[PDB]
């Protein structure tokens, strides 16, 4: 995996030696070349994983998250260059360096063969995200949101360090390839119960779980646009990736420890969607929608059936693209009205028709419109949870009702109605912004054509 790590690090001399007007063009160009090269991770087999070295490997789960991670960096560079136009050049290069460094940490977080190196990279991804939020965030509450984002993740993950080093002492190795074959069944005890909690609660925070999600409508809102994109698209998916790696070691104790978290997530996908029905902040509406979608990924991981993992990884990739595009659309309003209040700017389809078409497509993919991979993930998780318990179809269908309701309420409020009279700075849509929306949506619509590359290790 060194063939992606080395160009990602060579982005740093590429961004610290570029001209004062060239530091966006060159970084976008070469990160798009890295994203083109990221397709070579699709050499996957139906029995064996693509195993590179002692340090790095990539199965069919890590591969779509890797292509998504190496694709999201040019989109963050396009999104975050307008509000940093007035910025100092050195701080501009520092922002690009934090983005490049976060990509570097993520692409060797997903490919980490051994679990403590996964942990080191997984907690290494805090500090560029923390610096981006707390330094280039816009408002006063970026500092408190940085505190919440830091100290929920560390409070979840420092028990995970102790649990992983205990696995290193008991099994002899934290290699995932070794732990596929030396995995001992974990019986019922209190010690194995808190073993399970220390293994799971870090990723429960990072998904987020309902009740542990209070960091998210502050971190995803008070961030700048590139920070909100990477938080919505990759850093919620580190939790699902870590759960799918760590729940091998947690059988059969998962089959009764999963119940309180399954209740929390099945009820929180209703509660956060109802919250989205009464949000005045658009960026907070997209944040609580992200919690509402990742609750299904938590349930799909904890019921641990093959259909559930296929739906969970499709839902992760699809929600990454969709929620990143929704945050970029909210930025496209915020760069014109300078407020995140959803009831401020209305009637924008009269003024920005192509942008309203992008809003329409993103709101359709948010409410899981078939045959998108949003609906493929949503539907497969619904099938597997109906296999889990037949009564869960009530919660799943009521979540789908409220999800369609808040998605089209967002669409009708921002884009439809009569335009607000006292706002006269609604510029036309830039080529940069429409290109950003298209580079989100067009891969998402192309993945409906060949959806088998985003369906996990057990397609």
């Amino acid at each position: 995996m060194l063939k992606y790590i080395i160009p990602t690090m060579m982005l740093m001399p590429l961004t610290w030696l570029s001209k004062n007007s060239m530091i966006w063009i060159n970084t976008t160009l070469h990160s798009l070349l890295i994203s083109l090269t990221s397709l070579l991770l699709l050499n996957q087999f139906g029995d064996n994983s693509l195993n590179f070295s002692l340090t790095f490997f990539s199965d069919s789960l890590s591969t779509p998250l890797l292509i998504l991670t190496m694709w999201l960096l040019p989109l963050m560079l396009m999104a975050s260059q307008h509000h940093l136009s007035k910025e100092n050049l050195a701080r501009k290069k520092l922002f690009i360096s934090m983005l490049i460094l976060l990509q570097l940490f993520l692409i060797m977080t997903f490919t980490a063969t051994e679990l403590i190196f996964f942990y080191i990279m997984f907690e290494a991804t805090l500090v560029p995200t923390l610096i981006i939020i707390t330094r280039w965030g816009n408002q006063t509450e970026r500092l408190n949101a940085g505190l919440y984002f830091l100290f929920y993740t560390l409070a979840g993950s420092l028990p995970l360090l102790v649990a992983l080093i205990y696995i290193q002492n008991t099994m002899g190795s934290l290699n995932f390839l070794i732990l596929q074959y030396w995995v001992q069944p974990m019986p019922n005890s209190w010690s194995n119960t808190f073993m399970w909690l220390a293994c799971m609660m870090a990723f429960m925070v990072k998904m987020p779980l309902y009740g542990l999600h209070l960091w998210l409508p502050k971190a995803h809102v008070e961030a700048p646009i590139a920070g909100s994109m990477v938080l919505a698209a990759i850093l919620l998916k580190l939790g699902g990736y870590g759960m799918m790696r760590i729940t091998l070691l947690l059988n059969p104790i998962t089959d009764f420890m999963a119940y309180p978290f399954i209740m929390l997530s099945l009820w929180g996908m209703i509660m956060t969607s109802s919250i989205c029905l009464r949000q005045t902040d658009l960026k907070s509406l997209i944040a609580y929608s992200s919690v509402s979608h990742m609750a299904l990924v938590i349930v799909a991981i904890l019921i641990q059936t093959p259909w559930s993992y296929m739906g969970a990884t499709a839902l992760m990739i699809a929600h990454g693209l969709t929620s990143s595009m929704l945050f970029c659309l909210a930025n496209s309003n915020y760069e014109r009205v300078h407020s995140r209040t959803m009831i401020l700017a209305r009637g924008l389809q009269t003024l920005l028709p192509l942008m309203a078409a992008w809003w329409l497509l993103a709101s359709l993919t948010n409410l899981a419109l078939p045959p998108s991979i949003n609906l493929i993930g949503e539907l497969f998780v619904v099938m597997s949870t109906f296999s889990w318990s037949n009564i869960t179809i009530i919660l799943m269908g009521l979540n789908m009702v409220i999800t369609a309701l808040y998605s089209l309420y967002m669409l009708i409020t921002t884009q439809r109605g009569k335009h607000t009279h006292h706002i006269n700075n609604i510029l036309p849509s830039f080529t940069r912004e429409n290109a950003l929306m298209s580079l989100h949506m067009l891969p998402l619509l192309l993945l409906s054509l060949n959806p088998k590359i985003i369906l996990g290790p057990l397609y």
Binding site: L54, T55, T113, E114, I116, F117, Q168, L174
Partner: protein, 171 residues
């Protein structure tokens, strides 16, 4: 532990040298010259056995030789010896330097009648050699069996198998 094994009171009875310290100091150099051999057998037995219970016969030979020494003084040269140890006995620190004429009288009469020569400066402090017939003590400290040491290292130092083996560091 074990019962300590003491000699009887009859094993300790010997005819004592019941003279004063100035009497012993007056004829000290002739005592070192003439009573050399049983005294050195005793002090070698005393520094080798490291036990006074293993030295009782040698101490009795010391006491017998000292008694014969003072009886051989008393028969021939009793009055210059009494004149000499009285003058030694007068002083508090009992100096030899204060009594050189009584010393000359005593040494003269002793050399003339008993043939004893007073040793020179340096002679009584010599480390001598002692011909004993008793065997050498094989374990005077009664030291038990020593603990066997830990095994030493041996063999050529091969490299570490797959490096440090520290979680993922392949070197």
């Amino acid at each position: 532990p074990g019962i300590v094994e003491l000699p009887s009171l009859e094993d300790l009875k010997v005819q004592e040298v019941k003279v004063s310290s100035s009497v012993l100091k007056a004829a000290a150099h002739h005592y070192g010259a003439q009573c050399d051999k049983p005294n050195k057998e005793f002090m070698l037995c005393r520094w080798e056995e490291k036990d006074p219970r293993r030295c009782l016969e040698e101490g009795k030979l010391v006491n017998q030789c000292a008694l014969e020494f003072f009886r051989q003084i008393k028969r021939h040269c009793a009055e210059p010896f009494t004149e000499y140890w009285t003058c030694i006995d007068y002083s508090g620190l009992q100096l030899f330097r204060r009594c050189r004429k009584e010393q000359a009288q005593f040494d003269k009469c002793v050399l003339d009648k008993l043939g004893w020569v007073r040793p020179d400066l340096g002679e009584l402090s010599k480390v001598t050699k002692v011909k004993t017939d008793r065997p050498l003590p094989e374990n005077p400290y009664h030291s038990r069996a020593r603990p066997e040491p830990n095994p030493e290292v041996e063999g050529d130092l091969k490299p570490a198998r797959h490096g440090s083996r520290l979680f993922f560091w392949t070197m």
